[PDB]
Structure formats: C-alpha cells, structure tokens
Ligand binder design. Sequence first.
Ligand SMILES: *[C@@H]1O[C@H](CO)[C@@H](O[C@H]2O[C@H](CO)[C@@H](O[C@@H]3O[C@H](CO)[C@@H](O)[C@H](O[C@@H]4O[C@H](CO)[C@@H](O[C@@H]5O[C@H](CO)[C@@H](O)[C@H](O)[C@@H]5O)[C@H](O)[C@@H]4O)[C@@H]3O)[C@H](O)[C@H]2NC(C)=O)[C@H](O)[C@H]1NC(C)=O
Length: 361
Amino acid sequence: YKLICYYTSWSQYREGDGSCFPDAIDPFLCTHVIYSFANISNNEIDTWEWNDVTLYDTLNTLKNRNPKLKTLLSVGGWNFGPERFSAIASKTQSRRTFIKSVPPFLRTHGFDGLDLAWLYPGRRDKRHLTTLVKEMKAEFIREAQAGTEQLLLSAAVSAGKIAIDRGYDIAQISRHLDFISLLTYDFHGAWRQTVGHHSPLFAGNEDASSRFSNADYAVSYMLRLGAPANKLVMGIPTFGRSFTLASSKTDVGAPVSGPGVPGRFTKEKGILAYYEICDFLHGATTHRFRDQQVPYATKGNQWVAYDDQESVKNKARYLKNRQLAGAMVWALDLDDFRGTFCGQNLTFPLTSAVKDVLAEV
Ligand SMILES: *[C@@H]1O[C@H](CO)[C@@H](O[C@H]2O[C@H](CO)[C@@H](O[C@@H]3O[C@H](CO)[C@@H](O)[C@H](O[C@@H]4O[C@H](CO)[C@@H](O[C@@H]5O[C@H](CO)[C@@H](O)[C@H](O)[C@@H]5O)[C@H](O)[C@@H]4O)[C@@H]3O)[C@H](O)[C@H]2NC(C)=O)[C@H](O)[C@H]1NC(C)=O
C-alpha cells in the first residue's frame, strides 16, 4: 500500500502556527512526499519560490532517517496557466526541450521522480498529453542506463467524467505512468449557487443529477477506461469547503450566497484547513450525509463540508476493497501537523487515520 502526500511551498508563509516547513513532516508517515509545484521557464523545469533549493534540501533530508522514503517534484499546479502546459507540449521542440531538462534537475536536487499536475488538459490537448507522458517516460528509462535507480513518473488526473473524457487518454497514459492520482475532492464549488459536499464517497440516493460526481463513480469509471487498480491512488482531501448561507436554510440544497469567510491561518475564502476546522467545530452543529458517508458543519451563516477521521478511514477501506494501489492526501500542511488544534494529542491526525487503515489487511 502507497500513501502519496503533497507538501505545498506556499504554506511556509502562513503566520502563527499555520507556518509549515518540510521540517515538520514525519519521515515515516507517508511512502511518497511531493513538493508542490515547480515552475517551467525557457521550456525548462525550474524552481518557484525564492528558497526551494533550501526547502528542497530540507525535505530530501528526511530520507536520512527513512531510507524507504521517496520524494517527487510536482509541475504545474493551479496557479500555473494550462495554456503554458499546452504551449509546451504541442510543439515537439518545446516538449523535448522541456524533457531533456528534467532528470538532471531531479538528480541534482535529490528527488526520485517528477509529478505532472497539468491541471486539466483540453479537447485539443489529449493527443499531446499522451506524447509528453510517452517521451518523458522514454527519457527516464534511457537515463537509468547511467547506472542509477530509475526516476519515477506520475500524474494527478481529474475525477470529473467530462473532464477525463475531454482530455485524457487513460488507456495509454496508464501504461507509462508509475502511478495515477485521482483528485476525488472537487465535485462541487461556490460556482454552484447551492450547498454541496465536494468529496463524497457515494452518489447518495436522494439527488440523481451528478452521479458521476463521487469517488466511487470515478474509480469504477477509470477502471473501465482501462487503468489498472495497481496504478490507482485515490485522493483524500484534508481541508474543507465552506460557504456563506444565503438563508437560515441548512439542510441539503440550502441556497448559498457565496463562499465562506477566510480562515485565521489559511487566509482564503471557500477553503479551510482541518486544524482550522477543528477550532470552528466548537459551537458548531455537526451532521453527516449518511448516504454519501461524509460530514458537514454549520455555525451562523457558515456551512462547511469536510472530512473527519471517520469519513477518511471509511474511504480508506474503500480503496482496499477495490484493490487499489494506495491513497493520496492533498496537503500535509493542511492537516493538524502540530497536533495541537484538534483535541487528541496526535500529530497529522487525518493522514494517520488513513495510514492505520492501509496498514491493516
Ligand atoms: C514561473 O515562470 C514565470 C514565467 O517564466 C515567471 O513569471 C514570468 O517570468 C518573467 C519575469 O521574470 C516574465 O517576463 C516578463 O514580463 C514583463 C511584462 O510584465 C516583460 O517586460 C518581460 O519582457 C522581457 O524579458 C526579458 C527577460 O526575460 C528582459 O530582458 C532581460 O531580462 C533580465 C531580467 O529579467 C535583465 O537582466 C536583462 O538586462 C534583460 O533586460 C527584457 O528587458 C524584457 O523586460 C517579460 O515578458 C514571464 O513572461 C513570466 N511568465 C509568463 C509567460 O507569464 C515566474 O516567476 C515563475 N514563478 C516563480 C515564482 O519563479
């Protein structure tokens, strides 16, 4: 069993305890840690933050304690225009240029693999995404010849039916990529005038419009398209999506007036770190879509949908029952890394819950 855990650069700058550095990551927790988002310039892979070489160093040092740990550098991200990927990958020149520039980067900085987080390729991009993957992987193979362990190659794919169907040639890309991460947590957003859970497990028998919008449908679908279960890792979010209620209505379908108030620490509308949610929860009312196996809280005109240890283990068993490669947790920085916000004196409570399940048979 795998546990792929992301670490995002921008989390350092958070204030108070919110600040987080690779420095605080428990070396034996996950099996794969992914530094989140490297840039691309002059078609070459490149750093982002002014101090990644430093933080790079600091994350890769964790392997001094856990030899089995592996680390990968992600490329792309949400604040990286999809166009920029498309532009690179449509002109063979740019593509190959980009590619031949990656292995040395990783070798130079201690990484064991590259991660492709091209956030949503288009209709016009499928044919080239297949290329990037192919060639990129061919290069990683030709470099093992130099007598070093072969660099890993993975990709974060959307879990949206349309999304996948629009820009993913799963069948192909699945046989090249060492593993595929399914972003099973973006099935809703403030862009929908009404309340909704973003990382539901099941379709839930009362609504029937977006059944394709749940981890189960996603998985079962990816399998159909051809991807094997030994390359699949299900995403598990460690944050929550919050809304500001446009009425006293709180039950399913209550109208939304817009995203939620920012977090003390995560400082950003619509989203909330687990540890922030832990504080929120106090004085809040907690419910749970028993149908879709996930909770939601409300306090005032603030409606929040999130994942708790329960819902998370729940999902964890799910992937075990479909025989998947492993689990993926989006944002360690978002978990209670210090373990002081969420009652129990446990560090990384959520990511642990999943580990403890996966550590089971
Ligand atoms: C991820 O990558 C991003 C793109 O590479 C990068 O953001 C950008 O990168 C550069 C800026 O560093 C940006 O370039 C310009 O934007 C300006 C307009 O707003 C233009 O004026 C500028 O045009 C020129 O480019 C020349 C250099 O590229 C510059 O010539 C010299 O450059 C030297 C210093 O830059 C200087 O020493 C020398 O004397 C030259 O003068 C020339 O003068 C002129 O100004 C660029 O178009 C990229 O376009 C922008 N990327 C895009 C496409 O949006 C991010 O920094 C990176 N992320 C992180 C955090 O690192």
